[PDB]
Amino acid sequence: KGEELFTGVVPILVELDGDVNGHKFSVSGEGEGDATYGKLTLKFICTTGKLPVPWPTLVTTLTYGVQCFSRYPDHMKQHDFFKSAMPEGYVQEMTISFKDDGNYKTRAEVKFEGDTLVNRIELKGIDFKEDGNILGHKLEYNYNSHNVYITADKQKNGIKANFKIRHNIEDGSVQLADHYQQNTPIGDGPVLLPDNHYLSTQSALSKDPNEKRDHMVLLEFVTAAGI
Ligand SMILES: [Mg+2]
Hints:
Layout: E1 10-20, E2 23-34, E3 39-46, H1 59-63, H2 81-84, E4 90-98, E5 103-113, E6 116-126, E7 146-153, E8 158-168, E9 174-185, E10 197-206, E11 215-225
Parallel strand pairs: 1-6
Antiparallel strand pairs: 1-2, 2-3, 3-11, 4-5, 4-9, 5-6, 7-8, 7-10, 8-9, 10-11
InterPro entries: GFP (IPR009017), GFP-related (IPR011584), Green_fluorescent_prot (IPR000786)
Subunit structure: Monomer.
Organism: Aequorea victoria (Water jellyfish)
């Protein structure tokens, strides 16, 4: 049972390579997860310089590979695909469609490296508008709460998820980002295929006052429900 790897605090490393409309960038993340409380504390740094898209547009890319840190109440533990795939892990893919603008396509490999949970990601963004809300940096530095709806994909011995993120524009409007996600196990062992349910996520974005590099400090809670 992979769930046994998550009874305490687990260190996390996130590494992302991106290209959006030919702007290339990399982000490195460090922090920890405590699934007992559905709690993620992470600090992300753009190692190539300035991030060419707003930080909030990368939150699902940078964290949805660590949905293994969701708190599954005991009565629903037989629905926790994510932990059950550990330690060998899973491949997560996402298509993120920004209404009236471009899209992101991501691939991540999520697994243990020793006692550390690692998220290795590639992002490709295309057909963004030069001064739309994303390349024009018109998004506020904040993050609304929302749910991730999960369904089983028995075919792939995995799960799918669908959800809408509403990013706050600086003028009071909303920039919608439709998400379609699929996860497939990397290993051979059996995994838990869940009944339909969702993850309730809440996120606070902040800055480290002594950090001069372009960065994002993130506190996130993720809790399974719907059953
Ligand atoms: Mg049943």
